[PDB]
Amino acid sequence: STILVIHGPNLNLLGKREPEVYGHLTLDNINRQLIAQAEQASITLDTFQSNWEGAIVDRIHQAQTEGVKLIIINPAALTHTSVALRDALLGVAIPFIEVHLSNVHAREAFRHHSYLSDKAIGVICGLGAKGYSFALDYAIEKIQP
Amino acid sequence: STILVIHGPNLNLLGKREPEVYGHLTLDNINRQLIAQAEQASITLDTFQSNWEGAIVDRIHQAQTEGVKLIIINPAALTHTSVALRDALLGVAIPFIEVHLSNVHAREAFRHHSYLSDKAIGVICGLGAKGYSFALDYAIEKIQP
Amino acid sequence: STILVIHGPNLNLLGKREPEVYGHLTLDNINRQLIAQAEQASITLDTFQSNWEGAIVDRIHQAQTEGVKLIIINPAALTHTSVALRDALLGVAIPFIEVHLSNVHAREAFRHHSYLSDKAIGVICGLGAKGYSFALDYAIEKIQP
Amino acid sequence: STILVIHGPNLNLLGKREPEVYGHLTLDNINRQLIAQAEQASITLDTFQSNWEGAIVDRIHQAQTEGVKLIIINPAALTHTSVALRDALLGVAIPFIEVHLSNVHAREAFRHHSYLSDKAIGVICGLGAKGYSFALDYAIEKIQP
Numbered sequence: 001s002t003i004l005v006i007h008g009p010n011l012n013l014l015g016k017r018e019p020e021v022y023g024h025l026t027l028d029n030i031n032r033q034l035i036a037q038a039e040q041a042s043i044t045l046d047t048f049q050s051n052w053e054g055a056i057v058d059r060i061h062q063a064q065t066e067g068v069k070l071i072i073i074n075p076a077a078l079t080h081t082s083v084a085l086r087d088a089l090l091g092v093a094i095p096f097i098e099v100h101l102s103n104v105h106a107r108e109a110f111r112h113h114s115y116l117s118d119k120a121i122g123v124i125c126g127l128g129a130k131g132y133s134f135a136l137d138y139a140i141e142k143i144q145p
Numbered sequence: 146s147t148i149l150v151i152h153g154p155n156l157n158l159l160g161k162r163e164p165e166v167y168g169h170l171t172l173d174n175i176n177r178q179l180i181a182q183a184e185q186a187s188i189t190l191d192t193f194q195s196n197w198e199g200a201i202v203d204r205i206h207q208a209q210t211e212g213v214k215l216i217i218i219n220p221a222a223l224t225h226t227s228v229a230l231r232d233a234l235l236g237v238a239i240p241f242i243e244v245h246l247s248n249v250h251a252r253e254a255f256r257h258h259s260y261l262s263d264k265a266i267g268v269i270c271g272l273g274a275k276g277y278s279f280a281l282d283y284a285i286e287k288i289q290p
Numbered sequence: 291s292t293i294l295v296i297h298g299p300n301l302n303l304l305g306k307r308e309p310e311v312y313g314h315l316t317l318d319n320i321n322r323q324l325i326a327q328a329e330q331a332s333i334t335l336d337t338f339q340s341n342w343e344g345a346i347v348d349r350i351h352q353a354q355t356e357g358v359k360l361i362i363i364n365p366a367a368l369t370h371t372s373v374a375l376r377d378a379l380l381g382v383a384i385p386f387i388e389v390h391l392s393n394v395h396a397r398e399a400f401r402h403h404s405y406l407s408d409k410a411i412g413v414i415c416g417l418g419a420k421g422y423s424f425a426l427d428y429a430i431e432k433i434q435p
Numbered sequence: 436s437t438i439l440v441i442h443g444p445n446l447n448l449l450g451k452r453e454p455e456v457y458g459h460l461t462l463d464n465i466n467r468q469l470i471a472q473a474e475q476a477s478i479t480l481d482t483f484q485s486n487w488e489g490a491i492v493d494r495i496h497q498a499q500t501e502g503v504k505l506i507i508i509n510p511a512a513l514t515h516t517s518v519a520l521r522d523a524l525l526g527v528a529i530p531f532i533e534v535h536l537s538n539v540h541a542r543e544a545f546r547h548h549s550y551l552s553d554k555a556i557g558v559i560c561g562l563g564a565k566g567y568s569f570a571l572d573y574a575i576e577k578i579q580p
């Protein structure tokens with residue numbers, strides 16, 4: 001696969017978690033849309049989610065070996081805490097775009113700091129699931145001239 | 146005047162200052178691409194660029210009187226300094242999206258704080274001129290099924 | 291085990307992240323040097339690396355049951371984030387030396403704080419693979435005066 | 436002399452208390468072991484201690500003129516206070532390794548900052564007088580493979 005989409009802890013709860021009090025679409029719905037999008041552009045796209053930081057790190061390591069050209073990542077809570085993730089992405093030297101569903105700057109102060117943002121191509125926050133689709137459009141044109 | 150795109154100070158310089166390496170597109174090129182994208186969606190797109198904070202504030206007050214529905218703003222340097230912009234946008238209560246061409250997290254520490262971001266629907270940084278198109282796509286869709 | 295060497299996350303990448311820039315020294319090379327150094331002093335050494343913080347915590351717990359007398363630990367990114375590792379090492383009451391390959395004080399400011407160093411016998415950083423060998427040297431002489 | 440060993444203020448006291456901070460050995464003894472270690476490897480080593488910052492700076496200047504290839508420095512209290520010393524080592528551009536006998540990160544907060552460490556090849560702390568012997572072992576391999 002040429003692009004890997006990674007989703008961090010708790011994002012498996014989307015739609016499952018508090019629907020109509022705080023839900024509606026799901027991770028599996030987001031994943032299908034992105035694969036379809038990338039399928040329209042003749043590009044293979046993988047996806048991965050985990051609540052375990054080591055699984056994600058491991059997955060990033062595997063990406064180097066598969067020749068993934070770009071990672072689109074929603075590190076979720078790990079954004080704020082995990083230097084291990086940062087050093088995984090820099091260690092494999094695969095460029096990445098960071099995406100958040102919610103506008104992190106409108107939330108608690110600890111959510112305003114990222115161990116990844118300075119090393120990303122760019123960041124999109126607050127635009128919901130559409131944030132991933134934008135990141136993918138960007139990535140497609142970065143690979144195909 | 147359904148959608149207003151505002152460009153802050155110095156953005157008039159795009160694709161001027163030595164065009165050998167990296168990026169060559171001008172503010173004018175960005176504007177035409179946005180207007181053509183808005184035409185396709187049947188939305189009327191207004192654009193404005195100034196180096197003067199008060200002109201930007203005045204244009205935003207004018208947006209309310211014109212019944213603008215949403216603002217896409219690249220406040221450029223004013224993002225870090227201007228409470229007056231924040232107040233104009235809240236005072237007219239037009240929702241906005243914030244866009245930066247560059248990844249501000251990779252730059253000096255003063256560039257990490259925004260008097261706007263916490264009130265924005267969301268923020269796109271570091272995806273170049275494509276960020277404004279993404280913001281527009283999201284804004285279009287926010288008005289229209 | 292008498293002495294246990296622990297490598298934290300991402301140290302599996304050594305020698306594969308970009309050989310012209312970074313070099314060809316691998317984690318296996320390190321481990322072989324250490325094992326031989328300890329074989330020479332009539333010392334048994336085990337090694338462990340993982341990208342998963344809980345595997346490293348459980349490995350530390352196991353060292354207490356195996357009768358390990360000292361740990362040499364390169365916590366990698368977990369030096370900056372993991373209270374759990376600190377709590378493990380304290381909980382089992384095995385002395386440790388902390389080793390970093392890179393000079394951490396020359397890098398980002400977050401790399402300068404640690405949850406471990408204040409409980410270590412000592413710290414070595416910046417001396418590449420040889421920092422481990424110096425720690426093992428100190429460790430061999432402590433257990434066998 | 437190809438390698439110069441610098442000891443900062445107070446380190447002439449090393450016999451007496453506080454010993455529990457490493458150690459019972461005296462300076463003359465430390466410098467006798469390092470001279471021998473350097474003999475067995477055919478390197479010419481000098482040593483220097485003073486309680487006066489200007490004398491250390493003078494000494495580093497002369498090191499330039501005498502053709503010194505590497506410095507091993509325990510700056511003692513000067514680590515936390517002397518920018519003159521930093522500027523001296525950088526000015527004569529001789530590479531250096533920083534050593535402390537005690538684990539500074541286990542001591543008062545002011546002792547955790549160094550005006551030298553970011554420019555050092557590396558740092559050893561907390562291993563007693565053996566940290567000097569390590570520093571010289573690395574230094575010997577750096578100048579003679």
Ligand SMILES: O=C1C[C@@](O)(C(=O)O)C[C@@H](O)[C@@H]1O
Binds near residue numbers: 077079101103
């Ligand atoms: O879990 C998440 C999700 C998030 O990254 C987002 O997608 O909005 C925002 C993070 O702060 C939070 O920890």
Ligand SMILES: O=C1C[C@@](O)(C(=O)O)C[C@@H](O)[C@@H]1O
Binds near residue numbers: 220222245
């Ligand atoms: O002027 C600008 C441009 C900018 O908003 C951008 O578009 O990247 C980023 C701001 O920090 C800077 O002051």
Ligand SMILES: O=C1C[C@@](O)(C(=O)O)C[C@@H](O)[C@@H]1O
Binds near residue numbers: 299300365394
């Ligand atoms: O992951 C690592 C590796 C490291 O521990 C080293 O061995 O140089 C230093 C840490 O700052 C970093 O987060």
Ligand SMILES: O=C1C[C@@](O)(C(=O)O)C[C@@H](O)[C@@H]1O
Binds near residue numbers: 509
């Ligand atoms: O004098 C010393 C000795 C020391 O550098 C050491 O060798 O542990 C630690 C310093 O903070 C203290 O000022």
Ligand code: NA
Binds near residue numbers: 104123
């Ligand atoms: Na953001």
Ligand code: NA
Binds near residue numbers: 250270
């Ligand atoms: Na941003």
Ligand code: NA
Binds near residue numbers: 394395413414415558
């Ligand atoms: Na250190």
Ligand code: NA
Binds near residue numbers: 540558
């Ligand atoms: Na230290």
